[PDB]
Design a protein around this nucleic acid. Structure first.
Length: 94
RNA sequence: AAACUUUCAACAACGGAUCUCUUGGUUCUCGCAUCGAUGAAGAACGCAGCGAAAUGCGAUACGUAAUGUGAAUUGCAGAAUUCCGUGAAUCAUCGAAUCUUUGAACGCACAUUGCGCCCCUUGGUAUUCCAGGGGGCAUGCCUGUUUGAGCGUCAUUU
């Protein structure tokens, strides 16, 4: 193969990428009785991305991630936590 | 005699005509030369602290930059916390950007967000398997480049 021109710039990025701490009435409960953080996402959710995300951002660790495509556009995730993260405990953030 | 019924008065009442209103329309005339593979026209889906739509905009989302205007407020003064003498959302701006998923549509598809192949770089750590970010693989022709094809055919030291 070969070349002599190209694309442009590494734009971007593309990642980020965990939405807005989707937490309400029942959600808090999740992060309570169960210890499973109810964040949200960007519909184009890269999936195990979410893992890498939380596992990076909030950084504690997670075990499952079942993630419904809520009736809104809201693509909200259902994350858990190994013996570490104690929910309300890792609810220093929210 | 009333009720009723017609009739004409005034008052309401149904209705929205007449009058006057005009950021429309309609027809005139006079300049002007520009779309797209450098991804167009069009479509979705989204983007405000608060928004349904018309409007503007694209994950940098009613907007970034840059100018001059500005000189003082914008989405102007809806409210609202709002924030300001180092220049605020307005005009111009197109000597910059961002420009999702698409559409001439483009690797294959596409009643799905489905299915492959390279190259670079991260984790598992043997390149060859699985996940993350970046760059990429349509067609017809133009021209050169670069490999190989025939008993088209030339000549060579055998």
């Amino acid at each position: 193969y070969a070349s002599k021109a190209v694309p442009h710039y590494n734009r971007l990025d593309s990642y980020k990428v965990i939405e807005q701490p989707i937490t309400s009435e029942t959600a808090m409960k999740k992060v309570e009785d169960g210890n499973i953080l109810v964040f949200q996402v960007s519909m184009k959710a890269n999936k195990y991305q979410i893992k890498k995300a939380v596992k990076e951002l909030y950084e504690v660790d997670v075990l499952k991630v079942n993630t419904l495509v809520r009736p809104n556009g809201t693509k909200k995730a259902y994350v858990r936590l190994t013996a570490d993260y104690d929910a309300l405990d890792i609810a220093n953030r929210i």
